[PDB]
Amino acid sequence: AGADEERAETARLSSFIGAIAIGDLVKSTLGPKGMDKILLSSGRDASLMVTNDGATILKNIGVDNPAAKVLVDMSRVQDDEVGDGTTSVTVLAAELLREAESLIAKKIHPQTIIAGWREATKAARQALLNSAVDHGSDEVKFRQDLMNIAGTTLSSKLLTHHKDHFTKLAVEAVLRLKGSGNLEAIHVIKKLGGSLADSYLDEGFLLDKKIGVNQPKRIENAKILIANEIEHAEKEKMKEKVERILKHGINCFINRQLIYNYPEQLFGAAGVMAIEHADFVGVERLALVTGGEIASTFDHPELVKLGSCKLIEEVMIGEDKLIHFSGVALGEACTIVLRGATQQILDEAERSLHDALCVLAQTVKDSRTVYGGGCSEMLMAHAVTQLASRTPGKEAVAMESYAKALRMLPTIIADNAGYDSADLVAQLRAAHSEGKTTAGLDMKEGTIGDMSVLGITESFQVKRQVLLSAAEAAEVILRVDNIIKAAPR
Amino acid sequence: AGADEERAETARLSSFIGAIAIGDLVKSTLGPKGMDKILLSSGRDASLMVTNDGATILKNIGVDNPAAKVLVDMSRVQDDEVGDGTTSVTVLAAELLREAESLIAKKIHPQTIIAGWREATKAARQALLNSAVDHGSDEVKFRQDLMNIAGTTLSSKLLTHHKDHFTKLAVEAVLRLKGSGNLEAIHVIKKLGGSLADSYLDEGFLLDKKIGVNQPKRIENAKILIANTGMDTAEKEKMKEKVERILKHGINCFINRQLIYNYPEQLFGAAGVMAIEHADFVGVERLALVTGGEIASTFDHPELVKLGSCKLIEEVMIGEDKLIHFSGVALGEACTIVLRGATQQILDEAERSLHDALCVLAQTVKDSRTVYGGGCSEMLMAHAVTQLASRTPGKEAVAMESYAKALRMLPTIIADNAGYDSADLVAQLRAAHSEGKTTAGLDMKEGTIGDMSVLGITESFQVKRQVLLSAAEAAEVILRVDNIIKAAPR
Amino acid sequence: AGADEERAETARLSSFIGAIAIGDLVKSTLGPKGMDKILLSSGRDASLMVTNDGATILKNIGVDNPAAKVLVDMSRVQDDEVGDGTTSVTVLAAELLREAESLIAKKIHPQTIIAGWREATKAARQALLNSAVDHGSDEVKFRQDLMNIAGTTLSSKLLTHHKDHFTKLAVEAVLRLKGSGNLEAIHVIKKLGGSLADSYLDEGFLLDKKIGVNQPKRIENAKILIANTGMDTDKIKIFGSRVRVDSTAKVAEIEHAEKEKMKEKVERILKHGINCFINRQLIYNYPEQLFGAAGVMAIEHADFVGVERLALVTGGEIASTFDHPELVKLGSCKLIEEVMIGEDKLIHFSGVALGEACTIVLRGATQQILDEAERSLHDALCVLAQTVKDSRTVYGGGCSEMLMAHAVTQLASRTPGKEAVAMESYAKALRMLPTIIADNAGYDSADLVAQLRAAHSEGKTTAGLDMKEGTIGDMSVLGITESFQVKRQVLLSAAEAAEVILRVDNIIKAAPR
């Protein structure tokens, strides 16, 4: 058939090893007490980088023969569709592999055991109806705008010491997006000058370029232009540009590419501020804001061009000479500007803000969430334990292993917190058994507490896709025989 | 003292490895189509030791540097008054070490988990009771007499074909023991011959010796004489004392624990008195309780200092070579069982088989309590304990949940050696117990689940009561003990 | 997956080892009698680089595999804020690890220990403003101007035999600068000759470059020209390649093209009256002959840092291509001249219209050590800009550290135990600074540590480690003090970086982008 057949015990082991490696590292990451980590490697890497988000680093590398990369690749779809919050989806899938050793004792066809997963699909559906997560997230909403899930996503991120404040800012941005506009015109930048607030919210769009040292410093009632024998001929390009420019009153020129030197002398004298190699992403986002235009050839000026005219200027906000575009007539799209002690860590704040935007959009639209901190998780575990006993035939071992699988999740949250796991697991279990869905793992507390007070809630999509996916990922590998990675090659 | 340094994670591994190696050899044994193992060791051993019973072989040898012998030594105490059923206390303890991998991840205090065994003390206790246990064995019992636990004890042993019939016989033996006598006085041996019955139960004590080719076939209203001092030692005068007062007592049989002088033998044949040369001492001491005893001194020994039961002593065909049977004892307290076999020396298996089987029957009569057999007791308990783990407080529950999964192995082990698929069996079994039918259990003959009560299989209440208490203490002193070195292995 | 796993204690050990190895080299660095380490390398390194300043050497090279480079990188940010005195912050972080041996004995998750660092911010924070400090320099100040911290900064440096005098000189320079912002226009350069003074103070900016021997000696009402682009012309848009031609004829046209560049430079030049030209980079030879005839002095490859400081001083320039002359450029005009006063000839720019910017010139020694003074003065200058702005400082010589140790011992017991086990470990960390200070001094550290604690315990903030005596004395008489900024920032930096590595067992995932 080729090479590396792996269809039985020698194949299962390869699956088994990949899952154990990922679980300990992803373990410290979860919730408010999640921990920042870096990696040491040699060969075109440069240094040790710290990525709090588990998904970002896994996509980046594929160091060894054993598999995990294909399992990892799937996690992106969950992130695309709903995102992150905390990383638990990979962990849950990894731990059920341990029962496979028990399964050899079972000593029969792996697939019959696999029937437990249709029931696992049931666990997702049965638990969702059993665990009253929330019925809130009305729209906009006063306090519930944040100090909830975004804080939790960020809490695992070290930047949370002052960052949680900017996390709060991001929901204000999501509420305005919702409805008639679409997912457009959202951009974020950071600045070296710093304040306690750590951020200013701009009504328009933030850009950082200058035409040249010469040119008018500030422009008012600005018009915006966006563009997609030989020596004498060159002069002709110069002349066409000047005649069209003066009539419009053009105060600013934005072009997405390289800009020719001849026009530049003219712009200074004319009183027009132009930007060299402006980024396309900023321009497109800007077009919704300024009404845009059709960016054809130099005929482009006047009516074919639509330019907003409130106020465009290059200002000092602290240290760097940034240019601020503000005064949007449309109102549909806005820009958020971040500040924060200037460093590599500040880049990390950029990472989690993206996380905040994605989580909020889904939470309002899905109309559902789950209790975080493992609250849903332990409760569901209590319900599933009874189920293993109920089933006859081969169902009982499979269901049983699935039921005990839920138990590790409480353990992972407590252990990252660092409070003693033995003590934590049962105390936790007693509270869920009682019937209080709100109660769960409180990492800050060191024991168990009320999750709802914390405000930690998870998007409904994150829990349903993971349960079906984690389950499916685990048993594709047992039956593998000759794919991309596994262990020996 | 000690000597072997191994510090943290390495020391734990030594304890871990010993438990896994022992479990595979004992695992085959634990069921109806159990497996027999024969062991050969170089010099320092004569040869031939094959043992079906796990406890007997572990006690005998210390094969290598890692230590399992101290864990092994403890099993005897369990064996003496509860005995066995099947060896399994050691198996359950071994699987406990697997959780230790979870413990390194836990990386806190390895002793903290130990509170779990304290949990084990009441979890096992609570659970044995929150099940239905037999309520049978009224007294004597027609059908319920056997085809029960003994059948399970036999199951491990290769014998169970013809043999399940043999164990049926063993309960008949308990019924005769029944009273204030407690457990003692039962001895059984194997004979090399072929019969469907494969065993014969006789009313008295079985001894295999003969005076000589000559002598009466049997004696009636027999008087039995036991002498400490030998007949071997003018010669005629010794002969005269022996005959003149022997006639007086009406002597019908003489048993001496040593060599016997030839002159007496000519005398005994004409007289009508049967004597036994070099009779084993152990047979003699039991016989004395049976016959009322005597005082064994010099030839003054006959008459009043001697007491003798008088029903029937004869040499009876056992289908092969001659045996001599003592019977009709007035006391009734002591009785003997005779086994027959193929000639395998896999029949010595019967001796160990016998030892574990006999202890169970005596306990069942005295305790007036038992549990359902065939693993019925074990699965139901597993159902109760899973709920219990979530039910209990912090430290106590994590260990309690692990303890609960231990019960799972017994159903699998019973079935695995049966010759049926373990996977189908384990899972099918749980639904029956879960439903609330305690009688239902593993029916190995069936290959599925069946009514244990019709079979009647029940286990002594003590065997379930003490395996769980003993297992907790031994399991507990493995994870928490580091240096562990004393006499024998290590 | 997996990238570099050694399993538990060993993982911790790599973090441990990185901290211990660095501490011994930085150890000799602190105190009045400092030691200089001479470092030589092959492959793109010219000669042995000797850096007294610990931060500068760590930044230059990342020699090996163990993790510690990132911890090192952070210290530079501190340098802009205040930075130096003596290198000590790296040492404190290192000794923190030594309590890790205690941590295995702790038998609990490391993170509980970790809450201690935010607490550590508290412990160290209590110490600031719990140890008197200095009321502050009134402004300018007759005697407290120096003979203080700069001497300590230079303590670590060998040149202190005459250097401490140099240090005294530096505050005079800072008095004119005194914070109307951060810090601009301070330039210092050495010369190859010996004098008892070993330095002179100049009203203007000192530079040392010359166009050539030819050109007028003196220029007045000087016009200054600064060009971003080099005078050099040839490579162009398209190389034309490595050519060759039919015998001799065409190659001459290439020579002709050059003349147009020469002429544009002179035509624009004569109208302005240009007295001096300064270019940051390579200069082209053809114009050089031209400047000599005109009577204009130009500077080849002038350093960029000098040029920008010069721009505020001269009113600035808009630097572009050869259209640069006339109005787009502004030129201050007093006197630019080559006077030479000492050994090596130099050019003095003076009488700047702005008045904001002034320059300092150092002298003496003339060897490997003198070359050191380039980064030595900058270390002194950065501290001073902060000192007037802060209006607050703390006693030097380790006075601050022992007092803090007494307070922190109480804290471990005072707080509930989970917090409690590690405040003390943080607390004992402060003990090493007194020990490191004393060891380089040349006196026995144990005795030194011993005499030190009683003074601080007693209640005298002024009392500290006197390395020169070898005993304990009054720091205030010495005048040595540390800036307020060095203490608040280091404590925050130590808190984040030191134990996050401990709470993590040899890292997890990365090698990305």
Add this chain to the structure above:
Amino acid sequence: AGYDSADLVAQLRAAHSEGKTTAGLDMKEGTIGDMSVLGITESFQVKRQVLLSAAEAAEVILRVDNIIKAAPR
């Protein structure tokens, strides 16, 4: 199926021997069942060709020793 192969063989043979053509392997069942109720039937062409083809397959074993190629190295 997920059921033990050994058990399956014996039970299957007894039903066919008896005379019920409809009866066959029921994998969901783990034993034997009525194939017709499922509705599972196989095309006549697949069965006639395989048997003649099969003979040829059995026809290429022992009579042929080694002899390797069809496609580049």
